[PDB]
Amino acid sequence: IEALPTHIKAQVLAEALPWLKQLHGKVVVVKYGGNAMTDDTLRRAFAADMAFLRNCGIHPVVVHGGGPQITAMLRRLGIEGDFKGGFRVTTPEVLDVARMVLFGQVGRELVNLINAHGPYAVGITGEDAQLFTAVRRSVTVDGVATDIGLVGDVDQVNTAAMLDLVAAGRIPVVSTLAPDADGVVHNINADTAAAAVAEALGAEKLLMLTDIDGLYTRWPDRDSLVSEIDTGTLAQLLPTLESGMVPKVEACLRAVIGGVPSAHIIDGRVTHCVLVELFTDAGTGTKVVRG
Amino acid sequence: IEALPTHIKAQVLAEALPWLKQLHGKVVVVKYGGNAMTDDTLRRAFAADMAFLRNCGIHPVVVHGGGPQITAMLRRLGIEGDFKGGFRVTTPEVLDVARMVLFGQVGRELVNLINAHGPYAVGITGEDAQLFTAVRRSVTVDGVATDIGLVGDVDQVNTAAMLDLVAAGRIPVVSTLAPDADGVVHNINADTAAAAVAEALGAEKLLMLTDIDGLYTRWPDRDSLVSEIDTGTLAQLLPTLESGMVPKVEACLRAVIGGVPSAHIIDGRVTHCVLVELFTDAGTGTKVVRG
Amino acid sequence: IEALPTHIKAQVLAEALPWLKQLHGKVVVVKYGGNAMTDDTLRRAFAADMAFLRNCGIHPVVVHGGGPQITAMLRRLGIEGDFKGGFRVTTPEVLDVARMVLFGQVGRELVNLINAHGPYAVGITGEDAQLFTAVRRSVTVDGVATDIGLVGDVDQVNTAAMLDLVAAGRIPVVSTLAPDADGVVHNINADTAAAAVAEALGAEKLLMLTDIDGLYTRWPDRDSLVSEIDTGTLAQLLPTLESGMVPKVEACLRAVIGGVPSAHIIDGRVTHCVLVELFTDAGTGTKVVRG
Amino acid sequence: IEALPTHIKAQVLAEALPWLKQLHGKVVVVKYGGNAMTDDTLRRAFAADMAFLRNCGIHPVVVHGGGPQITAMLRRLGIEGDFKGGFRVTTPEVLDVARMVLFGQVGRELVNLINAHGPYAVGITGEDAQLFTAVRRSVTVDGVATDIGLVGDVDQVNTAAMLDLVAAGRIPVVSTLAPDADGVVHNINADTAAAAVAEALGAEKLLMLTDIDGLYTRWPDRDSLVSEIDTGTLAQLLPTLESGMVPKVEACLRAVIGGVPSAHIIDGRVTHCVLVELFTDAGTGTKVVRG
Amino acid sequence: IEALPTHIKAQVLAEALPWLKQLHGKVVVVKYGGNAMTDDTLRRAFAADMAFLRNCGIHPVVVHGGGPQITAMLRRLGIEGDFKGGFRVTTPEVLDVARMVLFGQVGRELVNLINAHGPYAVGITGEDAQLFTAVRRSVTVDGVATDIGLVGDVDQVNTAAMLDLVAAGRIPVVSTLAPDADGVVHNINADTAAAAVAEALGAEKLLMLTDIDGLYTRWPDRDSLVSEIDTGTLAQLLPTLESGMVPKVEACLRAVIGGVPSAHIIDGRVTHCVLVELFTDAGTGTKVVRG
Amino acid sequence: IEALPTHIKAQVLAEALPWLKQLHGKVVVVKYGGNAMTDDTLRRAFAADMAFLRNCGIHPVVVHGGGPQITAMLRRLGIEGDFKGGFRVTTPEVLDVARMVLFGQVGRELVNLINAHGPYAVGITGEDAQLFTAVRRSVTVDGVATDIGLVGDVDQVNTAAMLDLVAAGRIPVVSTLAPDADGVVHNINADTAAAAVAEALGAEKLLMLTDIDGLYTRWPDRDSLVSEIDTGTLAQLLPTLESGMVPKVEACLRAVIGGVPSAHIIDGRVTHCVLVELFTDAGTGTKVVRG
Ligand SMILES: CN1CCN(c2ccc(C(=O)O)cc2)CC1
Ligand SMILES: CN1CCN(c2ccc(C(=O)O)cc2)CC1
Numbered sequence A, B, C, D, E, F: 001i002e003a004l005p006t007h008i009k010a011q012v013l014a015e016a017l018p019w020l021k022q023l024h025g026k027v028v029v030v031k032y033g034g035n036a037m038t039d040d041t042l043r044r045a046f047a048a049d050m051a052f053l054r055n056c057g058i059h060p061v062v063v064h065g066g067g068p069q070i071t072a073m074l075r076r077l078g079i080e081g082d083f084k085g086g087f088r089v090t091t092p093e094v095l096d097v098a099r100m101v102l103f104g105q106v107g108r109e110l111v112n113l114i115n116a117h118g119p120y121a122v123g124i125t126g127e128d129a130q131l132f133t134a135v136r137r138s139v140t141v142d143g144v145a146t147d148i149g150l151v152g153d154v155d156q157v158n159t160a161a162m163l164d165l166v167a168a169g170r171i172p173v174v175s176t177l178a179p180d181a182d183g184v185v186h187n188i189n190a191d192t193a194a195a196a197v198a199e200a201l202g203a204e205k206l207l208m209l210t211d212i213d214g215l216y217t218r219w220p221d222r223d224s225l226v227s228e229i230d231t232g233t234l235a236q237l238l239p240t241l242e243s244g245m246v247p248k249v250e251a252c253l254r255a256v257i258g259g260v261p262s263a264h265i266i267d268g269r270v271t272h273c274v275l276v277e278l279f280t281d282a283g284t285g286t287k288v289v290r291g
């Protein structure tokens, strides 16, 4: 990449300046999942980008999922699943496995990758110092809300204690599990939890890494793809969208309505997508603002 | 326990005062393992004791093992073991399982138990913010030192960052895994790691919970049991001792020689053994001091 | 006290934990007087208990009286008293003697006793750094309110400066004298002053050491003795009570109504009564809460 | 004092500037005794001068004696004295009286006077928070050193804790009593104690208020009076001097040799002598420097 | 000045005490101009007085003008002026000259004079760290408001950042220039700017050095001179006053109405006028208070 | 610059990461002069680059010259010069002009440019709070060292006070003038002063903006141009070099020998040269390291 003239290398760096100003000293919550989590070069680029933010004096917070890895581990352990609708029931046994995979495996790899750049990453869950709690969630199947075991939503968040972590120069890598009011640990959808953390921390931005170019309003019409949309318009289009886009959009809606200036659906398939979305106007993502 | 006269209840509390003075504001590293970790009433008493220390303004640090749980998980996963001497070889696969069980299961339960008393516990490993590193260890089998994979000793310790944690009112619950100088995570014997943490943190005391009354010099002679011994005398008796007492004694030796005022082999089978050993002179344990 | 099984010694210590949690980092104001002040073993136990609180990270504040010692000194000096009702008139001369005995004798002994356990105690009065002021009080004799010289009530309190003292790890030992708005030092009833300090400091508890088992509602009916009562019910019973119980009850009323969660009338004749009342449910005292 | 031209009032103020520079943020220990302590207008001027120092951001520390007041109180109490040489033996009884008069009477008046200008003064002794200790002293009578009871010299000083007091904006008013290594409180000559405090605190100046114009080398030759002298020359002249000048000179010697830049023997009979000696070159005192 | 008795030197110093108390830790804004700025002995006395305030723990802030020096420099550079009414039009060229003379010459001399007493003075303008902004002002000539170029009023003030400067022990020496909302630097009348800084900083006093004894209500009637007046009465007399007294009075009005306890018109022709006005009741100035 | 593929824009940003890590929290002293100071687009790019560093949590310090502007002002004022060798003699008059142009004109423009991006820049000289001093320098003409008036070298530097400035988030813009030990302000060569500031502040890098591609060892041989060289080799080549390269090389030598890890001669004619040199390996400059 050095057959590229050095005066255009200058221009791309200098063009980052207004976004460096906007984010210096600010929290950015990054939902990390999908292919940016399974391909090794995307993974290493994601970790380097978190170190980038940290070495600009920005405060990244990383929230991660791990759906497929849990399924794989349960199959290896021969744990037979129960399914209501399209949902696995989270028995105490499935939770133990989920937590052990999310916190003891998926979070650990990301911590080590990030820490290749310095002593930055620290892994946590709602359980650690009671950072946050969960409330049991029901899901709606075939019209009826119903119980699927120990799954929840983020209840309340120790905002102060988390902000201390990032001001110390740490990158929290959050595994979405947390105790309920009775001390019973639930598993939390990582997309929703990221929106809840973003709003509780007064984040400047929420980034949602997904495996798509961005939100299409009439998928698969190629020119239905938007680069920016407001909460009011996004709320109306949501019952139109594909199954897997629902949680990423609901999280954005909730976050931006909760006061987070903007939320972003960006393409995790692009190397250094974080860098592209934050420090460049050539972003493929779609930006959600209030309106 | 109230058929007991209230003026003797006074005397037992008042008799704790000199040990409260000696430990106020001081670090105490507690190696936690054995039966105090599998029986639920001993477990709940261990957690309540950590909260006790914390609510006296003492700084407990908890180091935990989990040998049998790892074995059980490997069998469930059908992972065939390789054995040199009496040692399982820690392949990258066994390490992934070990870390996932130690940090994602065993540490999590203790964090939640402790946190039933308040937002105190926080789980970590050498990986988090590069708190400590490992160096690969060899073991000696049938006379010859030899490789058994990704097992190590604690190399160096970010003393400052850990002391910050405890001064914030947190109880670190340490799972003994850490990266080597190249970022490759090793598993560390929990007994040795506790001694290394104790010495690096300038701990006032190291407590080693084991399943025995204390050190017997001529096991099983009932009256060979000691209540106190010095490093010089303990060093000489060590090649005499039982297989499983070796690591607990080596850790004490190393810790006390490293400047930790005293190390204690106490009986994990006793409810609230920590409270008994620290705040009472009726301790069953054996105290190791330098000499 | 070691013919007592060590597993019951554990249980009494472990039973203190919820009261350690409730009082960690909290102010406790202790009115100290009566026999707990004249018998040497009770005195030494009172001082050791203050060191106990301090070495649990609790913030004890000690308020003391000294009625009889003042009388004795005035007789030694041949100072003839004037009496209205049952009250000595506090001339400037009597105040000089009172202050010199309270601050220069009674407070000093307690400071030295406490300091046998460490550099904790510090003696003060309203005069020092203008910590608190007094307003002249009148008393009612035979129906008529009337002047008895330089006696007062605590007027206002430098809450901030006192809290600094205890956060520095100090135990203030307060002699109840303070200047009025014109700089004229008055003597203050120690019971009332303790209630005023408790309320001004946001104390968690006020303990009143007196020479009785507790409040009897129909003295001397043995089974009129209560262990808990509310302000509304206590207010109604007050004109029924014995002469010397009035100030201890009024102080409790005022304190608990002022927002102090509970006030306690405990028996100063019991060694380590403080320890018994705070860290044990076998307390002989009576607890006052709002209602 | 306003028949004085306003442009000469300017000049006297402006002439204080170099001494304000030299003492800003510095400790000045002031031994206060003699007539500056018994005449009310001198007393009020002494207190106003301490407030002056404090309101220039200077850190005054006041050490006081009280010999005659102790004698008067002992006579009032009919306490028969024992005398070796010219020294009263300090029995435990005499100490109780001494402490009660120094701390409970003499110190209190000065605290209240100073506090007429603000919440500045705070009274203390070696006993409070173990600020300093004493070691038993013997005196030499008719050639032989001998015991005179509970009299001592300042042993060691909690330099840090005292400096905290003055940085908080407080004026410590010290009564010279302190515990020995066994907790037994001794009385300390106020002149010597002031020198010891000055040296322990790194004071910039020690001022010794005495009832004389200054040191005369050949008393009563009017022109033997000096305004400045060095430790070497002062040490040689000391066995020549009057009985009561010995302690004031020994204190200066010890202080200046201990590293205190200068010590000053100034006339307590002059209103606002402190102000004259510190902020004016027309001082009557004598300055001691090292040489 | 030493043919003056030393006991009257005491009295003048001691008479400063209540003004030291009133100003300790307080901001005093000093408009410095006129003859106190051109005569070298008045200048050196002004600088020594700023050091005096600083070495009493007072926080002086110095605002300075420099009208005549700008005129002289423009003539030296042959810059032809344009005049509307009696006002020079401030072209970009005149501003460059003004700023370069005010900040690069007049402010520098005062900084160096003050710094002869220590590392205190620091020169600044609205431009530095955006300490304050300007808004373009129009003037009224022959009845009509009209533009005279890049002249303004102080718009808003970074109160926090300035208070940090003085708490660090610095003396800001302010040259009255500042950017408007678009970054265009304007020149500001120093009298008005001093009033604006005084009000923004919560100053205790504003002193206005001018070349007159004080405000005369019927100049030149010798006994129309006042020593104190309120804002309501001063506002009514203002359209009566001389041309050059208008800005000094308007600044006082605005400041005292803005909450500054008092503003003072004092005679810059008097050596150490600052010292006389602040620490003496023989001040020639006139004090403005609200009413 | 958006006809450039967005995945190469990513790569240039991501390639800055190791230099962000190396400079986060570090001082970088930037000598700013030449054409990067007279062309408006280079100037605006220089200011934006200083804001860039600041919004990465880097601590830029800007040192500036202004030779030609001083000459122009002296000619406008008709100040006749005296010349020894090729040096103007700096009379007190020339110094007044120099300081007024450097601090009151050249520094002010840069402060305002930088401040277009935020409240960052602050202008200073050695005079402000005595930040640094000068010692009079002589120059050597035709073999003989000789006096050229009030020109000097940086003597000593208040390292602490400057580091406070940058930690507050400020960009100091230094005009190289400072008082000597007697308070007499001298003018200092900006190249040398930048090296002295770099060494006194423990700077990570010194950048020297000059109008050349870099150091040529055999100018004008096109392929004598180096990209890196050590102090030992650079010292030997220095008497070979062009007149104007001498000060830029001497400054580098002194700085790197003084412990500054590297000094850089970079081309001020390139837009955003700072960004290119720090965050890119395509730098045209030459790096000086010790050897
Ligand atoms: C010492 N390192 C590792 C742990 N880090 C944590 C982890 C968790 C928490 C918490 O949940 O409160 C705080 C610090 C701090 C830096
Ligand atoms: C230095 N020790 C002794 C005095 N202590 C006091 C005493 C009184 C006050 C006050 O009344 O403000 C503060 C500290 C602090 C610790």
Ligand SMILES: CN1CCN(c2ccc(C(=O)O)cc2)CC1
Pocket (backbone or CB within 6 Å): E122, E124, E128, E129, E131, E161, E165, E170, F122, F124, F128, F129, F131, F161, F162, F165, F170
């Ligand atoms: C380091 N010295 C010189 C500069 N001083 C300043 C100057 C300006 C500012 C500002 O305008 O923010 C702060 C400190 C601080 C002390």
